[PDB]
Predict the structure of Xylose isomerase.
Amino acid sequence: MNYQPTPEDRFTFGLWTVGWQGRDPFGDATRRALDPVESVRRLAELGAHGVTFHDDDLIPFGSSDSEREEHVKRFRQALDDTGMKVPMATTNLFTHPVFKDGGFTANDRDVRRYALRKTIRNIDLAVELGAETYVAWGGREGAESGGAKDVRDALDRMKEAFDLLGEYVTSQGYDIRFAIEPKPNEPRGDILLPTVGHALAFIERLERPELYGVNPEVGHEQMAGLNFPHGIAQALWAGKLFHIDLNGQNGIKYDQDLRFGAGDLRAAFWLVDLLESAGYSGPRHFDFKPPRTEDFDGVWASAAGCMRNYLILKERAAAFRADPEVQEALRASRLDELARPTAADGLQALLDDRSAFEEFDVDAAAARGMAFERLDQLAMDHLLGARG
Amino acid sequence: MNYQPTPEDRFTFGLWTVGWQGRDPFGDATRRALDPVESVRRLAELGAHGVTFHDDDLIPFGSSDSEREEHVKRFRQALDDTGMKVPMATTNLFTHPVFKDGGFTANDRDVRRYALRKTIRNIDLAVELGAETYVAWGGREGAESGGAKDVRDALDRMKEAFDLLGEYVTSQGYDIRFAIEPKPNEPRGDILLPTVGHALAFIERLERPELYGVNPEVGHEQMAGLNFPHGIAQALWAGKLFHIDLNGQNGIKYDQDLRFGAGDLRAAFWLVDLLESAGYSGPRHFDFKPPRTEDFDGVWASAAGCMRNYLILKERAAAFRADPEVQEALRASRLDELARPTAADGLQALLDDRSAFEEFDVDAAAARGMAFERLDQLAMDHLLGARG
Amino acid sequence: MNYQPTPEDRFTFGLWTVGWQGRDPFGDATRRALDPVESVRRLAELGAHGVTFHDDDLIPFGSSDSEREEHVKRFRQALDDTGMKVPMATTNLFTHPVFKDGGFTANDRDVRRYALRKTIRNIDLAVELGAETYVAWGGREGAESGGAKDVRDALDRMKEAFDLLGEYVTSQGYDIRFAIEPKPNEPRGDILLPTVGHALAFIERLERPELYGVNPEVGHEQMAGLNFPHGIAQALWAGKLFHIDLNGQNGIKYDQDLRFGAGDLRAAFWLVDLLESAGYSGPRHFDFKPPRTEDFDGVWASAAGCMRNYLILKERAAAFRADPEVQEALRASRLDELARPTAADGLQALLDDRSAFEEFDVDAAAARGMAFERLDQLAMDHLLGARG
Amino acid sequence: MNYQPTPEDRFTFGLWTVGWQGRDPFGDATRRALDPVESVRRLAELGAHGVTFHDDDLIPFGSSDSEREEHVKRFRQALDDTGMKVPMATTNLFTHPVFKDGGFTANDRDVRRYALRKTIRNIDLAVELGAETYVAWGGREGAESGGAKDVRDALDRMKEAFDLLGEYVTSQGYDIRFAIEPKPNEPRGDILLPTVGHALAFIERLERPELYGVNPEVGHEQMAGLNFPHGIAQALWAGKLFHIDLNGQNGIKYDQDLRFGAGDLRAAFWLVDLLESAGYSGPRHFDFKPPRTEDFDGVWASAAGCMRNYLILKERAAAFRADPEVQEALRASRLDELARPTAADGLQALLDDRSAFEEFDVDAAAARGMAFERLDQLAMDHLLGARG
Ligand SMILES: O=C[C@H](O)[C@@H](O)[C@H](O)[C@H](O)CO
Ligand SMILES: O=C[C@H](O)[C@@H](O)[C@H](O)[C@H](O)CO
Ligand SMILES: O=C[C@H](O)[C@@H](O)[C@H](O)[C@H](O)CO
Ligand SMILES: O=C[C@H](O)[C@@H](O)[C@H](O)[C@H](O)CO
Ligand code: NI
Ligand code: NI
Ligand code: NI
Ligand code: NI
Ligand code: NI
Ligand code: NI
Ligand code: NI
Ligand code: NI
Ligand code: NI
Ligand code: NI
Ligand code: NI
Ligand code: NI
């Protein structure tokens, strides 16, 4: 019947999302700034579970130690009054002109040292607020031209930075983990660790890999034309999906950050299906931008649509899996065999198995249809609620 | 003056490249098949170092043990007469209809067992011929629809397969290593391990990671809009660039496999620059298709252009790096600082360093230009041979 | 409740669609060839309205005049027995090696003359069978390299060819019109008249523009990352949508030709909405390929899914428009004002209108939200059948 | 030897190019604003021919009639002192929040009337300054969601607007023409008239088509993965290339606006080749953004690189065409035949010509290679200055 979200659904929003003033490359802001406290109250009314923030969203850049203290106190009371949580925090290493060539991988060494200190300062605040995950989006790490950045040295600097933060966390005894958010491009011509895969590979080279995971975003992988649910499957397979950014994107172009459900709808369905069947227990975080055509009423409707869409898809995906006709179709397509080991009998046995080569009837096997189209139409019917 | 390749340049070609008959999705072959022996002699005349092959290129599918023996003997004499080497070999797990849903990750278990036996048989042949690398391109591993393939189970099957081959190699005492070739899509809607990053991450989950590397292809990463030289830098950083496939691609669309140099020319320049300065010593393998508009004279001209283009770029990249004006520009852009550790002084020292935050003048740092445009124009001048 | 198609729905299929044997760039056929007569009977059973064909699908290439006559007679009886119609026909100017550099724009003049004769021969057959539209897809018209094709001369040849066919039709007194099908690339590196826009512009340069329209395909425009429904709106605006090819595509990559409904689902919804509200009365033609993983049962299920998906979307789009809440939302977003002339009062009046500039309150106007997000969520609810 | 530009080369720059302060979606300005007068003097020193402007670049928005007059006088003296010309002008209908849903196609009628008045006011100024072309880039014309914009009505409003401007120009007796600049997306999710083709088609529906042309931009067509030189060939073929925007773009992603020469280098070569051989006599306008990593010295170096790159390519393209070996290769590939009419003998003659079908030897024709690869390698050698 209806689709009301409750804090139990674990839906979270960055302050910078509903707070996006509408400034784009070709235009000025179309909305006034939101007081983070108003955003907390409004999201709470909508059924959200918590909020996330960059240091600079909560405490204006260059704020003194006193002003800083007041901003946090104000934010803290709003949280106490609403029951909202703060499961994730991050650093802004992309807005200020000093980070024009990056933070952790800036060619200027002094800039790199500054970026680390700025991050460390915010990690202490994040722990103070109860955040369990600390996200790192290296938006300025990259280049527009080939000779500007030696990638191998840049990767040495990136590893050095992450190892230092890991040494810091472990020395303060914090119970906080890191999640690297990949993005292929924008604002840099090409960004380092462009996809979930590159991020996962890099993590295996850190001194304490256990502390690092990935924070994939729907639109980012889609900006590279990749299959998001497949990338998420691989991150789960590796045990590295620490957090997730949900939104929508219409193909390969600029990062749109539409509300979740918009963009590639079928991909959204397969994503929810995967997260739910895999038992993902982390937050369902929306990193979206309510389009600039909207006024404040439009932003809250956009935020509500994020949660609504997730809930509808969850219903349809659940109905899909529980359908006996679908369970039969899955067996018809041999999904059950895919889950069985190819050779639990071992190498030697396989080599001696004449049924696996010498006596294998390749034409008989080749003639078997996979029945994938029937299966996919069942999935389509379920998504559209068209199952008679 | 001129650009003649010699076997010392380590240029290699797959038999399937100059041998591509021109069959495409919408058209029939425009060229007769080439006898692998003729291809060996022709490539040798052109200055190539060696050739590579899929089992099915050398020995027709379904060949008896006797015919098989004759085909190899014939091929062996051609190699002896020309001095050509065979540094890499691979398996064809994509053409025959039996592999329509994959080889190692086919839902059908019997198909998966067959794919392993077929690969093992060819590994023995590869070692016999002296190949040091065995490439694996899972072209049929993937899907067109969401419910057809459970990616986590598929990744379990992929790992199982690679671990078994690793157990085989180590048991026969072979001195051969594996290289996984990624591709984002085509012929499947989405292919598993779509980019160099995903492949590198997966490798870290194998039982014997030391035996596996990556075989990236210029056009494949470009089909995802990614920066190829950056991906190669990361593979080198990880010590996993075991082999490389060179060709050209005009952006995001079907896999064109144009001759090397064609497609994104500037990317080709930065690639050669990187491979040469990094001391890549493996083969410079061309996996290209001479367009179907060509007759045989056109195919040999296309193959020659591959090597010619590599040699010209190598000259221009060498001239770029050795230019004192460029060395000065590199210092102006702080590439030297990027190579210096951010905090060799350690964590505690960084936290106590007031020059890294408290007394850091952010406006002064922000005002410094990176001088990247001057550097890039110097690179452009060098590429075009326009340095006065 | 259910979604059964009937010939009244005007659903048509090319013989080459359900008949696609599964041959792709990296693989052999996975299905035997279908007798066109069997395809006619099977599609009729499924509720289809008619079929379409290339000359070479019906009459094997190189067939004598007698064999040709028999093939047509056989096909004719199948049509008579089923009541199926043939509303569109086309020429195959892409498969045979002679068309490797094109048909109408081949550099070889003799080839260009041959292509015209081949098309003319099939136009006579099309009229004989009752086809009202003749489609032209210049799949081989284009290039892989810059100097191979002088585009201005190629466009002169393209216009010459179309003008000649127009002169032929008008001289035989045929009641048949032409529809040019655009495609950005594949099989050529870049194809001439790459999008609906380029095709529409070209048509305005023909001697008898009235005889030519466009035959857009969902996936083709999406291979250029364009909004298909927007392109269709422009073709309707110009009065040039003579026919349409329906299928699915997952973004920018090779031409997938998935069944309709698959690919970008939301785009499919907006397309059906537009065609139905605009009163498009031509055929709903599916130019799709049942994936090669399927056997014959899978191909017929895929074809049925094409029609089913169109019918479901038509229902949801109709429900969307007829919803009073949606009609109210449309007024809230000023869609009614968009339909009103900006200045029916004329130029002079506008220049003298102080309310249009001098006394225009720009801040007041800027503050009005467009309410687009609320509208889009209503559309999402309707698509998913989630309207309470 | 060297490549110095002189005003005779007709190189022009928009004030907004070298003046771009570096503000992007994720960052603040990294450069102070430039006084348009300083930009005029600086560009003049670099060898530029003239500058272009949006109304809002020259006269701050909301300026009184007096301030307006002073700004123009100041700008006028700078032009007189340098000898710089102003060949093109345009309107800013994208920055101010009032244009959030468009200017000419905004759903709000009052906004549409305001946009026309604002444009008309600037047309008078453009003529006053001597501009021969008036560009219109409908950056805000489009949508993020399907129901927000009825495209057919939007196209009615777009035509109404352009017809009114045409009526205005013709009534004032101005000798100024319009050029529509297409762009597929950004800042809107999808922009109306997304490519050169769509723009050309639309123009044929205006009341006075003679007054309208197109202003294509390198990067814009490349954001749709299209071949820019091919699009330019079609615009020239139609006699509609009134102006051109030159820059660089690295594939399908956000609009980078790199300096000319950067991005797809080979495409830049083929573009210059075409413009020069076609005798394009309009300005060579650069619409680029010096990357934000740069300080002012870097912006002037970037602007100089634009002109330098154009001059180098012009040299290489000229050398390519004048090479007798290339002229021979062109004949070998039948470019001379492409330029010959297919059937100047007429329709009836073609139908009676047995050599065009009945007696046409298709196998003989099919066997002829096009020799395109040899031709393309000659072009590569010339571009790289590697012709021995
Ligand atoms: O496009 C950029 C990212 O998606 C951005 O929102 C990061 O997620 C954020 O800075 C970390 O919380
Ligand atoms: O597009 C596919 C690949 O590039 C293919 O050529 C593989 O490289 C080959 O099968 C391994 O040698
Ligand atoms: O991708 C190519 C086209 O879509 C093709 O199927 C044409 O439509 C056909 O040849 C005309 O009927
Ligand atoms: O990306 C947008 C355009 O390229 C822009 O610069 C227009 O050209 C300009 O507003 C007209 O002069
Ligand atoms: Ni993002
Ligand atoms: Ni994003
Ligand atoms: Ni994010
Ligand atoms: Ni490849
Ligand atoms: Ni390839
Ligand atoms: Ni390859
Ligand atoms: Ni098609
Ligand atoms: Ni298609
Ligand atoms: Ni089609
Ligand atoms: Ni632009
Ligand atoms: Ni641009
Ligand atoms: Ni422009």
